[PDB]
Enzyme design. Structure first.
Site, PDB file in Angstrom:
ATOM      1  N   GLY A   1     103.062  93.041 -51.804  1.00 19.55           N
ATOM      2  CA  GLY A   1     103.764  94.204 -51.266  1.00 19.55           C
ATOM      3  C   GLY A   1     103.957  94.236 -49.760  1.00 19.55           C
TER       4      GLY A   1
ATOM      5  N   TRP B   1     112.646  80.878 -52.572  1.00 18.33           N
ATOM      6  CA  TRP B   1     113.500  80.738 -53.750  1.00 18.33           C
ATOM      7  C   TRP B   1     114.741  81.630 -53.676  1.00 18.33           C
ATOM      8  CZ3 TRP B   1     108.979  81.173 -57.862  1.00 18.33           C
ATOM      9  CH2 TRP B   1     108.164  80.029 -57.759  1.00 18.33           C
TER      10      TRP B   1
ATOM     11  N   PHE C   1     110.737  68.986 -56.366  1.00 14.46           N
ATOM     12  CA  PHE C   1     110.135  69.583 -57.557  1.00 14.46           C
ATOM     13  C   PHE C   1     111.248  69.922 -58.562  1.00 14.46           C
ATOM     14  CE2 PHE C   1     107.872  70.896 -53.629  1.00 14.46           C
ATOM     15  CZ  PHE C   1     106.771  70.049 -53.736  1.00 14.46           C
TER      16      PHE C   1
ATOM     17  N   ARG D   1     113.616  78.741 -38.116  1.00 19.11           N
ATOM     18  CA  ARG D   1     112.801  77.623 -38.565  1.00 19.11           C
ATOM     19  C   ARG D   1     113.460  77.067 -39.825  1.00 19.11           C
ATOM     20  NH1 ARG D   1     109.612  75.231 -42.856  1.00 19.11           N
ATOM     21  NH2 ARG D   1     109.141  77.360 -43.541  1.00 19.11           N
TER      22      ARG D   1
ATOM     23  N   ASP E   1     113.715  74.873 -43.043  1.00 22.35           N
ATOM     24  CA  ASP E   1     112.825  74.291 -44.029  1.00 22.35           C
ATOM     25  C   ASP E   1     113.347  72.943 -44.525  1.00 22.35           C
ATOM     26  OD1 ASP E   1     110.760  74.372 -46.284  1.00 22.35           O
ATOM     27  OD2 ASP E   1     112.625  74.468 -47.434  1.00 22.35           O
TER      28      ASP E   1
ATOM     29  N   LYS F   1     113.650  66.943 -43.680  1.00 18.49           N
ATOM     30  CA  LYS F   1     113.640  65.554 -44.152  1.00 18.49           C
ATOM     31  C   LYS F   1     114.425  65.397 -45.468  1.00 18.49           C
ATOM     32  CE  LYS F   1     110.539  61.664 -45.080  1.00 18.49           C
ATOM     33  NZ  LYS F   1     109.124  61.254 -45.353  1.00 18.49           N
ATOM     34  N   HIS F   2     114.780  66.521 -46.086  1.00 19.10           N
ATOM     35  CA  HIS F   2     115.363  66.523 -47.434  1.00 19.10           C
ATOM     36  C   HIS F   2     116.830  66.933 -47.486  1.00 19.10           C
ATOM     37  CE1 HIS F   2     111.455  65.490 -48.971  1.00 19.10           C
ATOM     38  NE2 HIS F   2     110.938  66.470 -48.249  1.00 19.10           N
TER      39      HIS F   2
ATOM     40  N   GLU G   1     111.025  71.745 -40.108  1.00 13.23           N
ATOM     41  CA  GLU G   1     109.786  71.219 -40.654  1.00 13.23           C
ATOM     42  C   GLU G   1     110.023  69.847 -41.272  1.00 13.23           C
ATOM     43  OE1 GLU G   1     105.916  72.795 -43.004  1.00 13.23           O
ATOM     44  OE2 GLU G   1     107.805  73.153 -44.054  1.00 13.23           O
TER      45      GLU G   1
ATOM     46  N   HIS H   1     101.104  77.638 -43.549  1.00  8.69           N
ATOM     47  CA  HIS H   1     101.170  78.165 -44.912  1.00  8.69           C
ATOM     48  C   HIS H   1     100.895  77.109 -45.988  1.00  8.69           C
ATOM     49  CE1 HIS H   1     104.969  76.437 -43.676  1.00  8.69           C
ATOM     50  NE2 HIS H   1     105.225  76.217 -44.953  1.00  8.69           N
ATOM     51  N   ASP H   2     100.833  75.838 -45.590  1.00 12.44           N
ATOM     52  CA  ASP H   2     100.596  74.756 -46.547  1.00 12.44           C
ATOM     53  C   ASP H   2      99.253  74.052 -46.357  1.00 12.44           C
ATOM     54  OD1 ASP H   2     102.924  75.117 -48.060  1.00 12.44           O
ATOM     55  OD2 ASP H   2     104.105  73.777 -46.792  1.00 12.44           O
TER      56      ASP H   2
ATOM     57  N   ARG I   1      96.885  81.869 -48.325  1.00 13.91           N
ATOM     58  CA  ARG I   1      97.821  82.983 -48.148  1.00 13.91           C
ATOM     59  C   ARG I   1      97.253  84.297 -48.665  1.00 13.91           C
ATOM     60  NH1 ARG I   1     103.307  79.873 -50.202  1.00 13.91           N
ATOM     61  NH2 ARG I   1     102.922  77.938 -49.029  1.00 13.91           N
TER      62      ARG I   1
HETATM   63 CA   LIG Z   1     105.972  97.098 -49.714  1.00  8.93          CA
HETATM   64 CA   LIG Z   2     118.357  67.978 -50.603  1.00  8.54          CA
END
Ligand SMILES: [Ca+2]
Ligand SMILES: [Ca+2]
Length: 683
Positions: free
Chosen positions: A51, A102, A196, A228, A230, A233-234, A258, A328-329, A375
């Site tokens: 939240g 996502w 993935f 930033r 994400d 490299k991809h 990154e 975060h990783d 996290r």
């Molecule tokens: Ca909230």
């Molecule tokens: Ca790609």
């Protein structure tokens, strides 16, 4: 406005970033919380929405928590609408888009974080408190998908401000790649195949290229101060250079990507990316070494200095490297036991070159090894912790002491456990001593410094057991004891400065655009800014900042210098890249290009973007596995719009470069859309 002002959004070297995981920070508004399986009010099921929201961040800006720490920038996850599906997870029960990774619509907000009005409130509240706002942006993919099972998740479906573009199944438009998942077996494999099960966006598709450019402009128009990017490299380098030009031509902001690097990892593609893309990088070489030396005991201070020297050599824009000790990783830096190591790693980062970023909760000694254990909901807002106060004392030095924001780094004393290093920018100096050993003291003899003669107090005020030093006119420091776990910081800020350039941004520009030159000693009366030897038109002039219009020089890289109104000349700031025009991503394809073992095909041509026939800077090695197969080679390349280019392909390996025979290939780059040009190798 000075170099240090919140409105200077192309220079973050004087800032300290605080990286916030929005959902896991503060739930400032319960009415915007998800309902049902998406939401966990207990804050214990670590892949659900807890939240946390933009109002929550606003609260901690308004109430002085962040400002009390000397935070001058925040970095938040992707603000865009994410999928609503709850996905199975055998360990955590359910898995949600709480993390923002996502996307389903890059032009709308994640309503759980807030509306565009909440976002506006966040931008405005941050700015009122001299805090810049960086957003994540993840154009590599939408969301988890199965092509064969379109009922899974939301099938990676993408919307354009509410209008369905398409999903991963029945992708008749070719908005996504359909090459399976990457095994990270090559740079190429990792670009064109899915990360993935995330539906890999096809940025070469003209609709998608245009969409992503339009989408980032939505956020630029909301007043963001940085991006930033994400998974850099991809995605193709060429596409991203093209994407960067779209951003920088519209309203330039500091952008960093990154590109993960592991411990001891060497990758020339990472160096190239940082030097050529028009964006900076998260500094994994710095972060991984800091962890080896301070956390995990797998290298010594010698390795730390070696990293400082090597990174400064490799990266053209060392002051733009975004440094950090965890994120975060990664496993959270604090891992149990003494808190001194994390305090030291913080102090090192805060006084070292680049742009420091601190992961939320580091200052509260939060623990958690692995996503999503790293996290957890923010545990405390205790402002009395040693770490909070290390940040409070050192963060402002990036604004007050230009040696820390912009200076070189020199080793002044070293052994396995001790690093004494000096930051220097003209006559501005910071000298930092760190002893990582928590049980052993060291006698410091033979130390020299550029600090003027005098006695210097520890800026930390003994918080990390620091103490004073005495410096002679010849720079010799009176012997002193560096106690177990000691950090001390000593400084001198000069009352006057010769002209000195500490930063230029953006680093990728073109004629008629405005660049910002930051430093000291420029004077208040307007002088001259030179691109090589060619003057640019002055937009504004102040002692610490000059804005200048880029002159119509031959496209290529230029070294910037400044001359005061009295005729004093600054140092040069090198390698500012002047493009030929607005950029377009073109896929170059060459058929029937056979090679011997160790030999690859490269692209060369008659514009700066293709290296102006310089074979040592030819584009490549080209790709030949995924989109097309050997002996067809391909590459996605940023080139100037509407320009008729001449080009050839070459083969090189180490022996003797082989060029295509015959006349040059020619192609006119599209005016706005992506393009493809396919040719046959000429003997
Ligand atoms: Ca909230
Ligand atoms: Ca790609």
């Amino acid at each position: 406005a000075s170099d240090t002002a919140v409105s200077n959004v192309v220079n973050y070297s004087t800032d300290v970033i605080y990286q916030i995981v929005t959902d896991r920070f503060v739930d400032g508004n319960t009415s915007n919380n998800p309902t049902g399986d998406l939401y966990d009010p207990t804050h214990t099921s670590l892949k659900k929405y807890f939240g946390g929201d933009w109002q929550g961040i606003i609260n901690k800006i308004n109430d002085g928590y962040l400002t009390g720490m000397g935070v001058t920038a925040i970095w938040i996850p992707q603000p865009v609408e994410n999928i609503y599906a709850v996905l199975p997870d055998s360990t955590f029960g359910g898995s949600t888009s709480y993390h923002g990774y996502w996307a389903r619509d890059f032009k709308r907000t994640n309503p759980y974080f807030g509306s565009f009005t909440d976002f506006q409130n966040l931008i405005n509240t941050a700015h009122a408190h001299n805090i810049k706002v960086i957003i994540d942006f993840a154009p590599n993919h939408t969301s988890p998908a199965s092509e064969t099972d379109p009922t899974y998740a939301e099938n990676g479906r993408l919307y354009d401000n509410g209008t369905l573009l398409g999903g991963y199944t029945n992708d008749t438009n070719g908005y996504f790649h359909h090459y399976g998942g990457t095994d990270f077996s090559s740079y190429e494999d990792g670009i064109y195949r899915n990360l993935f099960d995330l539906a890999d966006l096809n940025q070469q598709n003209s609709t998608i290229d245009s969409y992503l450019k339009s989408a980032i402009k939505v956020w630029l128009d909301m007043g963001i101060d940085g991006i930033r990017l994400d998974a850099v490299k991809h995605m193709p380098f060429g596409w991203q250079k093209n994407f960067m030009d779209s951003i920088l031509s519209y309203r330039p902001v500091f952008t960093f990507g990154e590109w993960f690097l592991g411990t001891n990892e060497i990758d020339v593609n990472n160096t190239y990316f940082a030097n050529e893309s028009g964006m900076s990088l998260l500094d994994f070489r710095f972060s991984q070494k800091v962890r080896q030396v301070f956390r995990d005991n797998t290298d010594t201070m010698y390795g730390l200095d070696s990293m400082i020297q090597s990174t400064a050599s490799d990266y053209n824009f060392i002051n733009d490297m975004v440094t950090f000790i965890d994120n975060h990783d990664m496993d959270r830096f604090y891992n149990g036991g003494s808190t001194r190591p994390v305090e030291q790693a913080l102090a090192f980062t805060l006084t070292s070159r680049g742009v420091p970023a601190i992961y939320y909760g580091t200052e509260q000694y939060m623990t958690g090894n692995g996503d999503p254990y790293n996290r957890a909901m923010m545990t405390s807002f205790n402002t009395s912790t040693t770490a909070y106060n290390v940040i409070k004392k050192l963060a402002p030095l990036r604004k007050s002491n230009p040696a820390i924001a912009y200076g070189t780094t020199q080793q002044r004393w070293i052994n396995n456990d001790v690093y004494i290093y000096e930051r220097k920018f003209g006559n501005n100096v910071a000298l930092v001593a760190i002893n990582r050993n928590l049980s052993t003291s060291y006698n410091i003899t033979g130390l020299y410094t550029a600090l003027p003669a005098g006695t210097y107090t520890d800026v930390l005020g003994g918080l990390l057991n620091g103490n004073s030093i005495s410096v002679a006119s010849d720079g010799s420091v009176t012997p002193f004891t560096l106690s177990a776990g000691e950090v001390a910081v000593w400084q001198y800020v000069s009352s006057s400065n010769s002209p000195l350039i500490g930063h230029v941004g953006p680093t990728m520009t073109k004629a008629g655009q405005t660049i910002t030159i930051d430093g000291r000693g420029f004077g208040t009366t307007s002088g001259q800014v030179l691109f090589g030897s060619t003057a640019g038109t002055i937009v504004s002039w102040d002692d610490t900042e000059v804005k200048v219009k880029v002159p119509s020089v031959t496209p290529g890289k230029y070294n910037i210098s400044l001359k005061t109104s009295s005729g004093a000349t600054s140092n040069t700031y090198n390698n500012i890249n002047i493009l030929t025009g607005n950029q377009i991503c073109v896929r170059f394809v060459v058929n029937n290009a056979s090679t011997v073992y160790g030999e690859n095909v490269y692209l060369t041509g008659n514009v700066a973007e293709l290296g102006n026939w310089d074979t040592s800077k030819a584009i490549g090695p080209m790709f030949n596995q995924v989109v097309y197969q050997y002996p067809t080679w391909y590459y996605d390349v940023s080139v100037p719009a509407g320009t008729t280019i001449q080009f050839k392909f070459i083969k090189k390996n180490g022996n003797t470069i082989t060029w295509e025979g015959g006349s040059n290939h020619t192609y006119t780059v599209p005016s706005s859309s992506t393009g493809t040009v396919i040719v046959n190798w000429q003997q």
